Ligand binder design. Structure first.
Ligand SMILES: Nc1ncnc2c1ncn2[C@@H]1O[C@H](CSCC[C@H](N)C(=O)O)[C@@H](O)[C@H]1O
Ligand SMILES: [Mg+2]
Length: 306
């Protein structure tokens, strides 16, 4: 019911998308919403009021791309608008599991926090693994000569492309595929907002895919990373008695043997019902002395207070 809508940015001229992006930038996230802001916050709107804001071409572009649907008397949108860090982003509305389509796209739960954690440097070539709405890809595109975003969710790939087009971004490409498979060559920069939470080792769905997706990611990251390259991962970690996450991580990465420096910043923590520990934190691979370090950083709390 939510997250299966058809998204078709190829059905609309790039200039028309950029223009809609321009209008969105004026109103999405700001007080006293116009019909376009209303549309993109889930409120059905009168088509004629919309026309005056985006033009009859804009109206058609909204329809052709899947951004709006004609309920006869009113238009409504399956998507919701965000504006943040210089970028306008459409994604699915935040709703509960029971009403989520299998292709439901991350409604930007942690996006804004993660952007603020990311190192400020830019560079040659960036990869955004599991790109979702494309939000992180869009932000990286300002700093990096080109950006590739990858997702196994084909609808996320469409959404990302639409979002790139709305912002008039030229240097960002998206590909459908499984993990690193459609990502050819090596990268200066790799970001992974990983689909892990409380599911332990078990695949539940594309937003809670289990620890094996992290294993696949980190085993393959050495061969995908330019020397001196940076990796940033948002993830959940499960420590089991006699079996801490970091030693599995060390084995996956071939840490000593590939000469990587890794830092795990742990933000949240709770005892598990087996004497182990669940953690949430932020993992950084960056140039420097080979080895693994764990540091405390309660950035969730700090983000909440400021
Ligand atoms: N095997 C796989 N290969 C590529 N992407 C995958 C994948 N399994 C899950 N994903 C994707 O990983 C994403 C995690 S949510 C993060 C989305 C976006 N980067 C953001 O920060 O908002 C989801 O979009 C999910 O579809
Ligand atoms: Mg789920």
């Amino acid at each position: 019911i939510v997250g299966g809508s058809t998204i078709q940015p190829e059905r609309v001229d790039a200039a028309a998308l950029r223009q809609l992006g321009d209008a969105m930038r004026k109103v999405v996230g700001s007080a006293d919403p116009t019909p376009l802001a209303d549309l993109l916050s889930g409120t059905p709107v009168d088509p004629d009021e919309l026309t005056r804001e985006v033009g009859a071409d804009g109206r058609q572009a909204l329809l052709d791309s899947g951004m709006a649907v004609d309920d006869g008397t009113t238009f409504s949108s399956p998507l919701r608008g965000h504006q943040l860090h210089g970028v306008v982003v459409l994604s699915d509305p935040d709703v509960e599991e029971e009403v989520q389509h299998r292709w439901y796209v991350d409604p930007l739960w942690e996006a804004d926090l993660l952007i603020r954690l990311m190192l400020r440097r830019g560079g040659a070539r960036a990869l955004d693994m599991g790109c979702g709405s494309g939000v992180l890809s869009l932000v990286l595109a300002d700093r990096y000569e080109s950006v590739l975003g990858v997702d196994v969710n084909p609808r996320a790939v469409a959404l990302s492309r639409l979002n790139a087009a709305l912002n008039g971004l030229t240097n960002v490409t998206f590909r459908e595929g499984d993990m690193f498979e459609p990502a050819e060559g090596r990268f200066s920069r790799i970001v992974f907002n990983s689909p892990t939470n409380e599911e332990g080792n078990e695949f539940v769905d594309l937003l809670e895919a289990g620890e094996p997706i992290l294993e696949t990611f980190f085993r393959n990251v050495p061969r995908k990373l330019e020397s001196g390259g940076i990796v940033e991962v948002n993830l959940a970690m499960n420590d089991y008695p006699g079996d801490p996450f970091r030693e599995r991580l060390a084995d996956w990465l071939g840490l000593t043997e590939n000469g990587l420096r890794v830092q795990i910043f742990t933000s949240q923590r709770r005892a598990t019902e087996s004497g182990g520990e669940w953690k949430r934190g932020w993992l950084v691979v960056a140039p420097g002395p080979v080895g693994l370090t764990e540091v405390e950083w309660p950035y969730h709390d700090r983000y909440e207070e400021d």
